[PDB]
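Training component of the fellowship. As part of building independent skills, the fellow (R.M.) carried out the full modelling exercise for a liganded target. The chosen ligand was NAP. The inputs are recorded below so that the supervisory panel can assess the work.
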Amino acid sequence: MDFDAIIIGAGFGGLYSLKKLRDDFNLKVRAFDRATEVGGTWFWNQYPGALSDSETHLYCYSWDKELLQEMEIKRKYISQPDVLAYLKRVADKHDLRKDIQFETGIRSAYFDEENSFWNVTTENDEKFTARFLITALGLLAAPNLPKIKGIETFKGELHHTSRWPKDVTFSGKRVGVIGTGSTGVQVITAIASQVKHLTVFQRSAQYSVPIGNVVMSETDVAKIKENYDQIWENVWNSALGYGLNESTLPTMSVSAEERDKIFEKAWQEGGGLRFMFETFGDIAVDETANIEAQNFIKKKISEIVKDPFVAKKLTPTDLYACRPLCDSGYYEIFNRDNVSLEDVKANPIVEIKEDCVVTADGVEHKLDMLICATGFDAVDGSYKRIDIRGKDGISIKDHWKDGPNSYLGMMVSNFPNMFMVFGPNGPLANSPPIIETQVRWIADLIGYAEDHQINQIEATKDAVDNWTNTCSDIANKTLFAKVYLYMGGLKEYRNQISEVSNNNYKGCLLKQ
Ligand SMILES: Cc1cc2nc3c(=O)[nH]c(=O)nc-3n(C[C@H](O)[C@H](O)[C@H](O)COP(=O)(O)OP(=O)(O)OC[C@H]3O[C@@H](n4cnc5c(N)ncnc54)[C@H](O)[C@@H]3O)c2cc1C
Ligand SMILES: NC(=O)c1ccc[n+]([C@@H]2O[C@H](COP(=O)([O-])OP(=O)(O)OC[C@H]3O[C@@H](n4cnc5c(N)ncnc54)[C@H](OP(=O)(O)O)[C@@H]3O)[C@@H](O)[C@H]2O)c1
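Fellow's submitted model of the complex:
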């Protein structure tokens, strides 16, 4: 049938895209998701230790103040089952499920350049027509299974963290974990005390700081809910949106005693972004500052891990670091008698047999269970996995063959009436604040189309290449170089797009 808008995704971005377009702008709209329930990545990713790296009171929606006062704030950080339960309550309250079609994947989306709408086809050969396409696909594509010889011969339990089954038990089992990223650190910390023996196959050690996830008292929660209006105003007025006191103090402008005290204070409070952006202001910019942040965490590793040779294996060797990981006792794990750490860069994995992982030294690591916390493909992977064709039938895979590009992280030279929520080339901040910022900006432009009887918004290649130059300008100011992301912060990003919404959407081709 016909719709004013069609949304792909029932996660954070899709649920708010549905609420804003349907109830506030009174548009006819339908959303689609492969899953059986809302939640997005929080429905799929149920691996042990899954936890937000934003604090509980900020990893949520800000637009429903009755929901904020209603909100469950159990611990300082929120687990996957509680994020899922929160998103379900959002769907229960605002009557969202009746306009979501579940168990329905989108195969193709073709823009009708004549009638100026999109032709969307599901994986079941069902076709829907709609003026606008809202893509809220998130950061997911399950496969980065390790390309290891004989991985298909393993007869024990083999799980990727994105497809974690239920009823997994660990007692009496020899378990292996490949990968020490954010997910691997969470899995290893959660299961180490439950397994008979754990082998960690680390190819690249990373910096991790304690998260300090503690229960929240009723007065801790009251201290938040009573000041929630000011808390969100600080989010909109910040670069990261994590509720941090973002520092402008340069690292080398204080004594070594003063520097050590500031790093220790953030370490005790917890949080990876706090240690990097609440301590000082040039850790991601100046090289000498970045090395000081490294040395503090290296000193912490050498203090926690009592075996100096294990601590050495856990210490990163790269000269310059980016954002640390957050953990609830990761480095303490490696003091346990039932934990073995394997440097698979000096001793790579060469084969997987029916009952073991064998490294280059010939040692067979016998395992009952092998966990692959090996990550996924890139941002665009969610977009290139759908057959999206825009003007002159050009596909989203072809136009993004040389990496992704967009205008304000929301529109592409492929997009005539297709708006990206949390898409590539967006800001680097707390996701729910970013998602609210884009959904409100996208609905404003769509409302700016219904009143003026316009039916085709497009973005120039000049505007897309101008957004690429903006991001490339800020990105090369930082150590994070050596254009996927805008690194100017959430506040400046809201100003970049406000100058567009004010100047009658400069860079956008409107056709009546
Ligand atoms: C364990 C974990 C912890 C995290 N913690 C934080 C945090 O603390 N702070 C933060 O800012 N971010 C965090 N993130 C990142 C997180 O992805 C975002 O916060 C947020 O979930 C993004 O919401 P989204 O709706 O844009 O994407 P998603 O939540 O991933 O939703 C995407 C949905 O679109 C669906 N979909 C896709 N494609 C298609 C298709 N062709 N047809 C049909 N349906 C489709 C998918 O099935 C999926 O349900 C975390 C991620 C994980 C996995
Ligand atoms: N920044 C955060 O705090 C945070 C928190 C939650 C989610 N996320 C996002 O979720 C995404 C995925 O996180 P993730 O931890 O699941 O994966 P990841 O960050 O991409 O890291 C995957 C880990 O598995 C290792 N690995 C991959 N292939 C391997 C192989 N063939 N052999 C041996 N080891 C291999 C990698 O080692 P190498 O490093 O050597 O490649 C890496 O340590 C991240 O990109 C991140 O953006 C981030």
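The panel noted the following from the submitted structure. The radius of gyration is 24 Å. The CA atoms of residues 188 and 423 lie 30 Å apart.
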